[PDB]
């Protein structure tokens, strides 16, 4: 973040789910993703629900 | 309304995501309530035709059957109102209330059946 | 047959507090409910002679 | 906050559950507590659910 002068910046963590624009600006690029370690980031979330994965769900598969 | 299939749902905390149909949680509520008044008129019947000793007393186990399902369903119908919420809960327990249903209507009035091989 | 009721109506009970377990602010005052009802089964069960004279 | 600058300051809202602290950052005071206004307070010690409550306990008592 840039103070009012503009020959220092400040460092500071403005959300950890908005997409990284500019280095003085912060704002999100879409919804329901996560910055992932490629330069585009905010983006790549796939469906968080296993097929038959978990076995919190095998009560109503044996009965 | 729609086919369905209302994918990335949006939640308070972006965290993760979950698949869903399009409003598969408050309008299939109507569809239910359009077997409920059915089962209710059927367990009407069923006080009405409960004194018939006929088919080994089957009157009594069809009054029953539609006794269990008719609990079940009155106690089914509110937690999946009130568990609208969340997806995985609210598969699981509508999947049980529906194996429930579908294992005592086989075991109350299939018991005659099963009783005399 | 009023004991198989009852066991019915448990089995029945059984998965509606397993699922209202879940975010226990309302399960701490539905649990009074609960009981309220199952006590009101088995005086059912137990009175349907006496309901019946 | 205190930029790079000596003479001001930046006005930024932190965390509400932060106490009144001096102008250099807001002070907490742990998980679960709540500071006050008046003199940075943290105490919010109340009771779980008063018996015959007007709020889902009235109908249970009575049944």
Redesign the interface.
């Known amino acids: 973040v840039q103070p009012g002068e503009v020959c220092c910046w400040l460092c500071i963590p403005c959300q950890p789910y908005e997409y990284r624009l500019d280095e003085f600006t912060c704002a999100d690029c879409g919804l329901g993703y996560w910055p992932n370690a490629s330069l585009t980031g905010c983006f790549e979330l796939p469906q968080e629900y296993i097929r038959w994965g978990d076995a919190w769900a095998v009560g109503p598969v044996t009965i | 309304e729609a086919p369905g299939t209302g994918?990335?749902t949006?939640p308070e905390r972006?965290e993760?995501?979950?698949?869903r149909c399009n409003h598969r949680d408050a309008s299939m509520l109507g569809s239910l309530a359009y077997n409920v008044l059915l089962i209710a008129l059927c367990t009407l019947y069923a006080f009405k035709t409960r004194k018939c000793p006929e088919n080994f007393n089957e009157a009594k186990f069809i009054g029953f059957t539609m006794?269990?399902t008719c609990?079940?369903w009155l106690?089914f119908l509110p937690?999946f109102y009130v568990?609208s919420s969340?997806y995985?809960?609210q598969?699981?327990?509508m999947?049980?209330?529906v194996?429930?249903s579908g294992?005592?209507v086989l075991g109350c009035l299939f018991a005659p059946k099963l009783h005399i091989i």
């Open positions: 994918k990335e949006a972006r993760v995501v979950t698949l006794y269990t609990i079940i106690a937690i568990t969340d995985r809960v598969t699981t327990t999947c049980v209330s194996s429930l294992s005592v």
